[PDB]
C-alpha cells in the first residue's frame, strides 16, 4: 500500500524559488490561516495552486481540498466546462458521479468529464484529504466528450520508461491515442537507482507535485532539493533531470495538456 | 484615535524594488506632477495605485483620492460590475450610499455593492483624503448580491492571529463564512513585539499598503524597510516575514480576492 | 526654429537594455531591411515601435512614416476605434482631416479622433518624415468625443515644471481638465541646466522617445546614456530622473493614457 | 547575571544556511562548528577549538580567533609558541585558571584577559566541568617610544558600558583599554544593543574587523544586505562595508568586537 | 577663492547608500567619517583622523590617506615613524605650521606640501580654530643612480592648471611636480572639470589610484556604471578600469588623484 | 580491489563546462588534463604531470599538488629541491619504486607515502608500464619541542576506514596519520562515501582544502550550489564554505583530500 | 610579409566598452593605450610605455609589461635595475638597436630577443623613424644544477610554427625555447590561428598567462563567455580557466603569449 503526503497544517517551528523558466514552492505554504474557501461547501478548507507563475498559467487549476468529518457539498463545480480529476490522498471520499456512487480510498483517481452532475462527501469519522484539478475542456468536431471512471493508481500497472536502467517508470489513466481528452493527470515514478538525465515528459507548461519521497531534482541548469508536499511549475521547454536518491521511491503527481492545437491569438 | 498616513504632495528635497516575485513602491512616488483625474469629479487628485508588477494584476485597482474641500462627485463610479471599498484616512467624508447618508471619519470604512447608486462629497473646509479598492465583482448562482454597510476599524476588535506570543492579528469587516463577499479588505496589525516567520495571509496575489509605523518586512528571502506610505504587490506564493521593531503598532491595508473557483482559459 | 532627429537608414558602420522595470532601444535599430508596411499605402516605409516589453504594453502603437516625394494614403487608417496623433519631424505633410487640408512643417502636431476620415500626401519633392501614434479611444457616457485640431509646438508657450530651478517644461496639446481626452502626447522639455532628481510625470507605463540633445537618463536605480532617437519605456513606478548636460535642449515625445478607470479583469 | 553562547559541537541532523561570502562581507553560522571539524595544538592536554580566521580572502591575516573547549584537568604550559603574539582571553562557559605575570587568577565567565606580546603564562581547567573561552591572536606593533602594554584580568560584568550619545540611550559599548592608551595596538570590546529600535549606523571601526554575537538575536544590514544574526554567529567586515542593526528582540543583543587600532596603516616595501 | 570640502564628524541621523565595492572600483561616500569611527597615532596631541586606505581587497597597500583634524594646539613633534615613508600634506580648512627642512610654513587651506622619506618635520595648529589635511603616504622607491625629491611647500591656488587638448579646454589638471623628474615616484594632483560637457575618457592613470572629490558634484562613470559623486566622496579604481565623467554641476568640479609612477612594476621574488 | 582515476591526456574532439570559480569555491573538470598543458620539473626523466595549485585568488598558495606520469625507465634521482618541502605520494595506477630513508619500496596503485621535509629519496618506474601518482607538496612549519615527522609507506587499501558516527555507516574516512601526531601538521586522507543517502554536513575541515574525486560520482553541494562531480574533478574550498553530498552512484564515491592542521593560524607580520 | 599592430596613442573622441573585469579573466581592449596614461622609466632619452601589469587582483605579478614606443635617438644605456629580472623583447614596428652580449642586434619588427637575468645590453632607436617594442619581465628562478639560459637573437618570421596535431592544422604555434630546456622558466610564443574554424580546446597553460593578440580577429570563449577581441586587445587568464577560440577572419589570427615555466609551485613561507 503506498502512502501519500497531505497538508495538514498545524503550527510548525526557504527553498522557494522564481525564476523565468520554473517555480518551485515548498510544502511549508500549506498553512492555517492561508487556505480558501468556495461557495456551498460544508465543513471544508482547501490550499490554492495556481498561477506559480506570471504568464501562461491559467490552463489548469489545482486545489488541496480536506473534508472535515461529515463534510463536502452537493454542488461542487460552478463551472460547466470544467473537467477535473479527483486524487484521495488521505481518508475516504464519497463520490457521486453520475448517479453511481464510489467510495475512494487513498490513491483513489476520478475523471470527471465537463457538465456532468457529480457530489462529494467525506462520510467517515476521520479527516479527508484530496487534490482537485480542473480545466476547460477543449471540444472538438467528430470527437466525442470524454466518459468518465474511477479506479485507482495502486491497480494500474505503471509503464517502464525506456531507459536508464528501467529505474524510471509512469501510471497513466488514460489511453495515448484517446483524442477523446485534453489533458493527462499522471504519475510519475522514480526507483531510488541511478541518474535521469532527461526527465521531461512534456514540452509544454505543467505541474509537478511530490507525492512521495525525497530527491535532488535539476530544473533548467539549476539543481533543487525537493520533496513530498513540494510543488514545481515549468514554464516550457524548461530542461528537467532527475537524481533520485532516497532509500524509498520518489513520485509526483503530473498534470498537463494534450492532443490538441495550440492557441493562436485570435487576431 | 489610531492615525494613518495620507498622500500630501508638497515639493521635497531609492528603495523601489521589481523582482519576478514582489515589487516594492515607496510613497516618495506620490508626487503632485504625478497625479490622475476621473471624469465628472470637482477638485479632485488621485494617486494610481495598481499593475505593479506585469503579469496577473489587473483584478484589482486602487486609489488614493483627495478631495478639495466642497469637493467630490455625484457620477463616482461609471463601471456597473464594480464593486468597492471606500477607507477614509484623513478628513471627513460625506458618502451618500443607496440614499442613506453617512458621516466618515479617519479609519472609516464602507463597502459598495456593484450598481448601487451612491456619491461622496467633502462637506468640510479642509481636504479630505481617502483610499478607493475596486474590482469586478464576480456573481455566482444561488449566492445573492453582498450588502453594503459602513462602519469604522476603530470600532472593529482585532482578530488576534494564533501565533507568534498574540503580538500579530487582523481587522476583518466580513464574516469569512459569507460567500456572498469575493474580496476581503482587511487591516493587519503588529505589535511591537518579536519576529513572525510566517506573515502569509494569502497564497495568491494581493496588495499591502502601510498605514502606520516602520518594519522590516521579507519579501521572499528579501528583507526590505517599509514605513506609512510605502506599497507592495506579492505575486503569489511570495514567501511574508515581518519584524516589527517600531516603538508604535505597524499596521498595513490588505485586499485580495477570495471564495470563487481560479480563472480558467476559456479554451 | 527647433529641431527634431528623424531615423534615416543608410548603411551605418550595444546599449540595448531590457529590464524587469524598463527597457532603452537605441535609435541604431532604425535599419532599412527591418521596416514595415501596411495596406493602402503608396511610397511609404516606417519603422514600428510598440511592445517594448512584454506584458501591458497593447495600449499604444507607435511608428516613425516615411513617405518618399508623391507618397501617402486616401485610407491610412483601418481601425475605426482608433484615435491618433501626427507628429511631423522632417519634410512637409499635408494632412485632409474632415476635408479640411493642413500643410504640416517640422513641428507639426495634429490629433484625430477615432473614426474620423482623414488622409495623409507628401506632394513636396522632397522626403517627410513623421511620427504615428495611436490607441483604441475609451469612450464614457457624458463625455462627447474629443474634436480634432492641428498646431504646431514651435506655437505652444512650454509650461515651466514648479522646480529645479524652472530647467524643466512641459508642452501639452490639450487642457488637463479636458475629460474628452483619453490620451496626452506631449513633449518634455530640459535646460542644460542641473539634475532633476524626480523627473517622473505619469505613474503608470508609458513612452518616452528622445527628439533632441543628450542626457544621462536614470531608470530605477540605473543610469544611462540616451539621445535623439532613442526610446525608453517604462513599466509603471519606474523611477525617473534626469541629467542633461547637453550644451543644448533635451527633448523627448511623451504619450500616456489617462482620465479614464484602470482597466479590470472581466471576471 | 549575563549570558554567553559555547559551541558544544555534537552531529545534530530541509534547509539551505545562513552562511555568505560577498566582496564586502563574510556571515558564519553557528552551525559550522562541528565535532569533525575542531583543531589541535601541540603541548596541550585535554583541548579542542573552532578555528575562525581568513573569513574572506585578501587582507585578513591580521587577527586569529579559536573557541577552545578544555575538558577537566585540560589545557597547557606552553600555550603560546609565537614571542610577537598578543592576546585577549575571554571565557565564555566554565572556570578557567589563568598564571599570568606570576599571578593566578580564577576567571568565570565574562572573564577577560589581556596578554601582552612574550608574556609568560599558561592555562589550565582545575574544575570538574568542561571550560570554554575565545582566543584572540594578533601580532603586536612595537613602537618606538612607546612601551608594551601591561596585562590585567577583570570581568566585563564589572565594566560600565559607555552609552552611545544617540538612539535614546539604547545601544552602546564595553571597552577594556582606554581610547588614548597607545601602548594597545588592537580592541577587543563587546558592543551592546538594547532591545530598542533602529540603528542605522552601527559601524564603530572603518577598516576590517570581526564580530561574534555573545548573545541575542536581531537583522543585521551589512552593506545593501539585511541578515538574520543569532549568538553563535560570526560576521566578517571588509571596510567601510555599511553597518545598520535593528535589534528587536526581547533581550539584550550584544556581540564580541576585535580591531586594530591606533597604528599607521601597513604600506608595501620596495 | 577655492573652497574644498572637509570632514567635521558628528552622528546626524529612509534612504540605503551610495557604498559601492565591485571587482574594479569601490565608492566610499563622505557620511562615513562618522565620530566614533576616527583614529590614532603615537605622539599627536589633539589629534583625529579619517582613515581611507584599503578600499577593495588585492594590490591596494601602496598608498595611506588620513583625513587629519587638529583642535587648538594640536599636532606633534615626531609626526612620522617610518624612516621610508614619504607624504603630501593638502590643506582643506584652518592654518597649518609646517616646520620642514629648517624652514617653517605657514600653511592655508589650498596648501600643498612634499616630505620626502625620512625627512625631519613637524605640524602644529597655532591658531584658534581647527585645521584639517590630508596626509597622503607611500614608501619611496629608491633608485641608483637617482637621487631623493627635494621637499617644497606651495598652494594650489598659485598654479597654472595644464588644460587637457580637448573637449574645448573644459577638462585640465594641476601638478606640482615635473613629468619629467624622475626623482619622485608618486604624484598627486587636482584633476579640474569646467561644468562644461561629457568626457568620454577622463582616466589619467592606467594602474590603480585613488580619486577624492574636493568640490563639485557630477555623474562619474566607473566601468559600465554612472555613480554620482560629490565633494567628500572618495572612488578608487582597480586598474585598466574606465572612467568617463558628466560634470554638469553649476560650479566647478575637481579631485585629488594620487598615483605611483616613474618606476618599474613590483615583480613577485624568487 | 579497488580503483582510482588517472589522467592520460589526449586530445579528445556542442556543450559548456562545468568548470567554475565562485567567491566560495572552484570546480575544476578532469577535461582539463589535457597534452598541451602538461609541465616538467629539473632533472625529471621521462616525466610529464598535470599541475593543481592556485584554484582561486588569495590565500591558495599553502599546498602543491601534481598528477605525475612516468613512462618506462622515468624518474628522478633529486625530486625534490626544496628543503623545507614536504610530501604525499600516492600511486593511482602503475607502479612505482620509492627508495626513501635508504628503504626501497614497490609501490602498487593505492600506494601512500609521506616524504618529511628535507628528506632524501628518489623515484624511478623500474616497469615497462607508464605510471602515475599525485605529489602534494607543502612548506612544513617546525615547531619548537615537536620533532619532525618520520616516513613511512603503506597501502590505503590495507586500512581500515574510521566510519562517521552517523548516516547509518554510509560515510567514513581513512586515514593515515594518528590525530594527536602533533609532529604532522598536514593530512593527506581519503573520505568514502558509500552509495546511501544523503550527507547534509560533509565538511571536514573548517579552513581550505582541496578535494579530488578519485572513483565514482556524486552531487555534491559546494555553498548553496549543487554539481555533479565524478572521478577526476577536483573541488578547491575557501573556507567555511558548506559542504553536502549526494553520493548516489551504484559504486563507491571517494576522494582524496589534503589540508593543513596542528598548528596556529598565520598571522601577517608587523 | 607579417604584420603586428602597434599602439600609436593619440586621444581620439554612444558606445560603452568591452573592458572585461571577472573573476576567471580579464579584457582590455586597445582603446585604452591612451597618449595621458603613458608612464616612464630612469635613464631613458625619448621614451614613453604604455603599461600592461596586474590585469586582476591576486597572484598577478609574475610578469610584467610594457609597449615601449622610442622616438628617433631614444633608448637607453641602463635599461634594466633589476639584476634579477629576465626579459624578452619583441619589435612590432621599426627598427630598433640591441647591444645584447657585446653583440649589436638590428631588430626589424618580428624580431625576438631574450635577455638573461642580470644581463648587460642597451637599445637606441638609431634610425629616423620611431620604433614601437614589447618588453616582458619577469624575476628569474635559479635552480642549482641549473646553468642560467643564454641569450639569443631571431624573428619569428623566420621560424616554422609548430603546428598542433589536429583541428586540420589550422591552429599552431611558434616557439623561440626548446620545450626540453630546463634553464629556462618562461615562454614567450605566438600562438597562430588560421582562418579555419572552431577550436574547442584553445587552453596552452593551466596557470595564469597573458594573451596580446598581434594580428586579426575572433570570437574567443574565456570561461563561459564568448567575446570578440582584436588585434591591440590584451586578455588575462587567472587558472583552469576555459579558453575555446572562433577565428573567422578573413586573415590570419594570431596573438603574443606568455607563461611561467619549468619550475615548482611557489609555496607559502612557514
Redesign the interface.
Known sequence: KSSYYAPHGG?P????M???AY?V??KG?M????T?????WDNMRM??????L??FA????Q?IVELAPNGGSD?PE??P??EAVLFVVEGELSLTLQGQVHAMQPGGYAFIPPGADYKVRNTTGQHTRFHWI???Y?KVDGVPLPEAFVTNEQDIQPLVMPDTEGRWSTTRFVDMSDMRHDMHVNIVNFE?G??IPFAETHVMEHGLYVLEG?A?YRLNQD???V?AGDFMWLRAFCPQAC?????GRFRYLLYKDVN?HM?LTLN
Chains 1, 2, 3 share one sequence.
Open positions: 503550527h517551528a526557504d527553498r522557494a522564481f525564476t523565468e517555480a514552492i515548498p505554504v498553512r492555517d490561516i492561508v480558501s474557501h468556495l461557495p456551498f490550499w490554492v495552486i495556481a498561477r506559480p506570471s504568464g491559467e490552463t489548469f487549476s486545489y454542488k460552478q463551472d466546462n470544467a480542473r480545466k476547460h477543449q531510488p541511478g541518474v525525497k535532488v539543481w533543487v532539493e520533496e537524481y533520485s536518491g532516497g532509500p490538441r492557441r
